[PDB]
Design an enzyme around this catalytic site. Structure first.
Site, PDB file in Angstrom:
ATOM      1  N   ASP B   7      -4.737  -4.021  -3.656  1.00  0.00           N
ATOM      2  CA  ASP B   7      -3.849  -3.385  -2.685  1.00  0.00           C
ATOM      3  C   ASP B   7      -4.523  -2.050  -2.398  1.00  0.00           C
ATOM      4  O   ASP B   7      -4.440  -1.113  -3.202  1.00  0.00           O
ATOM      5  CB  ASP B   7      -2.464  -3.154  -3.291  1.00  0.00           C
ATOM      6  CG  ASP B   7      -1.559  -2.337  -2.388  1.00  0.00           C
ATOM      7  OD1 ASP B   7      -0.461  -1.960  -2.839  1.00  0.00           O
ATOM      8  OD2 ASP B   7      -1.935  -2.071  -1.225  1.00  0.00           O
ATOM      9  N   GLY B   9      -4.641   1.269  -0.647  1.00  0.00           N
ATOM     10  CA  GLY B   9      -3.818   2.252   0.041  1.00  0.00           C
ATOM     11  C   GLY B   9      -4.632   3.395   0.621  1.00  0.00           C
ATOM     12  O   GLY B   9      -5.855   3.372   0.554  1.00  0.00           O
ATOM     13  N   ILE B  13      -6.484   2.526  -4.805  1.00  0.00           N
ATOM     14  CA  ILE B  13      -6.667   1.085  -4.705  1.00  0.00           C
ATOM     15  C   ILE B  13      -6.096   0.532  -6.000  1.00  0.00           C
ATOM     16  O   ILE B  13      -6.561   0.888  -7.088  1.00  0.00           O
ATOM     17  CB  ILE B  13      -8.156   0.671  -4.629  1.00  0.00           C
ATOM     18  CG1 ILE B  13      -8.811   1.271  -3.382  1.00  0.00           C
ATOM     19  CG2 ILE B  13      -8.264  -0.855  -4.620  1.00  0.00           C
ATOM     20  CD1 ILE B  13     -10.307   1.007  -3.291  1.00  0.00           C
ATOM     21  N   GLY B 100       2.574  -1.512   8.779  1.00  0.00           N
ATOM     22  CA  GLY B 100       1.646  -1.474   7.656  1.00  0.00           C
ATOM     23  C   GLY B 100       1.698  -2.770   6.874  1.00  0.00           C
ATOM     24  O   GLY B 100       2.783  -3.250   6.546  1.00  0.00           O
ATOM     25  N   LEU B 101       0.540  -3.349   6.568  1.00  0.00           N
ATOM     26  CA  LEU B 101       0.523  -4.613   5.840  1.00  0.00           C
ATOM     27  C   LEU B 101       1.101  -4.508   4.432  1.00  0.00           C
ATOM     28  O   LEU B 101       1.656  -5.481   3.913  1.00  0.00           O
ATOM     29  CB  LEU B 101      -0.896  -5.188   5.794  1.00  0.00           C
ATOM     30  CG  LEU B 101      -1.433  -5.653   7.155  1.00  0.00           C
ATOM     31  CD1 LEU B 101      -2.790  -6.318   6.971  1.00  0.00           C
ATOM     32  CD2 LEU B 101      -0.453  -6.639   7.793  1.00  0.00           C
ATOM     33  N   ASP B 102       0.975  -3.345   3.803  1.00  0.00           N
ATOM     34  CA  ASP B 102       1.552  -3.198   2.473  1.00  0.00           C
ATOM     35  C   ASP B 102       3.073  -3.313   2.576  1.00  0.00           C
ATOM     36  O   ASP B 102       3.704  -3.997   1.770  1.00  0.00           O
ATOM     37  CB  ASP B 102       1.138  -1.867   1.820  1.00  0.00           C
ATOM     38  CG  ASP B 102       1.265  -0.661   2.749  1.00  0.00           C
ATOM     39  OD1 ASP B 102       0.914   0.443   2.289  1.00  0.00           O
ATOM     40  OD2 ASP B 102       1.698  -0.792   3.914  1.00  0.00           O
TER      41      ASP B 102
HETATM   42  C1  LIG Z   1       2.662   4.170   5.833  1.00  0.00           C
HETATM   43  C2  LIG Z   1       1.465   3.586   5.078  1.00  0.00           C
HETATM   44  C3  LIG Z   1       0.285   4.556   5.179  1.00  0.00           C
HETATM   45  C4  LIG Z   1       1.845   3.429   3.603  1.00  0.00           C
HETATM   46  O1  LIG Z   1       0.739   2.900   2.865  1.00  0.00           O
HETATM   47  C5  LIG Z   1       1.086   2.211   5.639  1.00  0.00           C
HETATM   48  O2  LIG Z   1       2.201   1.323   5.523  1.00  0.00           O
HETATM   49  C6  LIG Z   1       0.623   2.262   7.099  1.00  0.00           C
HETATM   50  O3  LIG Z   1      -0.619   2.758   7.349  1.00  0.00           O
HETATM   51  N1  LIG Z   1       1.444   1.811   8.044  1.00  0.00           N
HETATM   52  C7  LIG Z   1       1.077   1.808   9.468  1.00  0.00           C
HETATM   53  C8  LIG Z   1       2.140   2.524  10.305  1.00  0.00           C
HETATM   54  C9  LIG Z   1       3.499   1.823  10.270  1.00  0.00           C
HETATM   55  O4  LIG Z   1       3.718   1.030   9.330  1.00  0.00           O
HETATM   56  O5  LIG Z   1       4.303   2.113  11.184  1.00  0.00           O
END
Ligand SMILES: CC(C)(CO)[C@@H](O)C(=O)NCCC(=O)O
Ligand SMILES: CC(C)(CO)[C@@H](O)C(=O)NCCC(=O)O
Lengths: 249, 249
Positions: B7, B9, B13, B100-102
């Site tokens: 994962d 970030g 990581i 965000g994929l996470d």
């Molecule tokens: C907010 C983070 C940075 C958290 O890791 C990530 O989910 C991300 O880069 N998201 C993209 C922007 C969004 O989710 O609206």
């Protein structure tokens, strides 16, 4: 003769010129010293003959500003300094010189005005909160980031978070779950700020009683004022404290 | 035959190696690709024969990392990608590719496990919160700075905020008003985090009902779990989602 007052922060400089005891006749926010000079230049027609200021910037940067001001107006600027006590209020820090002067002047002004226990929250670039007992004893306080700092870090210092000011403004029309980045970030950060304010009120109730006076200041105070209907929103609270720290005439 | 999962970030990581369907046998947190390679080659070698990962870093940074991993292990890395739907869960962003994929993998995993309305909060470097309806429809979510990001932005904001980890750790032993910078900042930031969590619980109760399932993940879930006794703390929640996004063998 009028008085030039300034509140010098790390990111911004707030200034105003007052007639008499405290009637403001001009003022503004400068994002840079050059911007400040430009601003003070257009209002160089005002009969400024005195100056007082509070600063949280380095001693050197504050001196450069003071010298700069004394060149724009015929004045000998007074600069607020640390103290164990002021106007019946006792500094609550272990090392009184470590307490930010902006926090100090605001909390002193608050108790001076209320003469009761109070909670003082400054919703600015950074956020600060201080509690003062009814007897004038500062209990201490808190520091956390404000909307400006949170937005800047996430919007430029992360990789996939991007959105402009227009969509940033439109994003705060609701606090429901965001369906776009600007919404997720702006609403997320505002909820964090609103949640912090509620935590502060809860802490104040426990340590000062549910009868404590609440003072809110800073440019973002309007974003959280609905949370505390009886709170006193005072944009120039720090200047009230500056008058107590640096009396003139 | 084991699987290496990662994962990636914006600041760290997180990786783990699993045996069978999901038994974690090794893992760690790396601050860089080098630190990761170091961690992967310092311990006793494991029979890694497959690899899958989710990343919110740039495509080039991700491809760069994949090149390293595929040289270190005899694998063809699977990389999670954006989707409008996964495991019965529907993406709530207007532009599904911007989520965000996470966040996506964690919220999908949460609903997959609960099959009920869910509130999913990741308390990590950054803080993210997403809500999913009982029918699997992602309502949207929020993004805020986490403890490390709040400290970092304040540190960058003023040279006045500087202290050791020991002092920082001691400061969190209480949430009472701080009487020193370390206390004011650490406690202020934690109250902001705790306040955000309560705002999230209130939003969830309103939009999902008082009986919604609450999932907490991230290294800092420990700092706020007392606020939600019935919450399901799942350190590897995102990896549950990764398995769904990138099935293997
Ligand atoms: C907010 C983070 C940075 C958290 O890791 C990530 O989910 C991300 O880069 N998201 C993209 C922007 C969004 O989710 O609206
Ligand atoms: C926290 C700020 C920067 C807010 O303006 C200021 O109050 C300050 O420089 N304070 C010094 C550190 C302290 O007050 O503990």
């Amino acid at each position: 003769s009028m008085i030039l007052e300034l509140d010098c922060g790390n990111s911004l400089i707030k200034w105003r010129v007052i007639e008499g005891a405290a009637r403001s006749v001009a003022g503004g926010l400068a994002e840079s010293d050059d911007a400040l000079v430009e601003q003070l230049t257009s209002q160089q027609a005002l009969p400024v003959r005195a100056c007082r200021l509070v600063s949280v910037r380095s001693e050197q940067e504050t001196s450069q500003l003071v010298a700069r001001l004394e060149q724009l107006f015929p004045v000998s600027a007074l600069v607020a300094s640390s103290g164990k006590q002021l106007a019946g209020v006792r500094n609550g820090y272990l090392d009184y010189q470590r307490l930010g002067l902006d926090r100090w002047l605001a909390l002193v002004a608050a108790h001076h005005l209320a003469k009761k226990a109070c909670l003082v929250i400054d919703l600015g670039t950074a956020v600060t909160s201080d509690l003062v007992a009814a007897d004038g004893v500062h209990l201490g306080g808190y520091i956390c980031p404000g909307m400006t700092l949170m937005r800047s870090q996430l919007r430029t210092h992360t990789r996939r978070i991007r959105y402009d000011d227009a969509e940033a403004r439109r994003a705060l029309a609701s606090l429901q779950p965001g369906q776009a980045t600007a919404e997720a970030v702006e609403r997320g950060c505002l909820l964090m700020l609103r949640g912090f304010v509620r935590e502060q009120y809860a802490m104040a109730c426990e340590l000062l009683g549910p009868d404590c006076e609440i003072f809110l200041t800073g440019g973002d105070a309007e974003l959280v004022r609905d949370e505390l209907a009886g709170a006193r929103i005072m944009p120039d609270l720090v200047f009230v404290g500056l008058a107590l720290a640096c009396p003139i005439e």
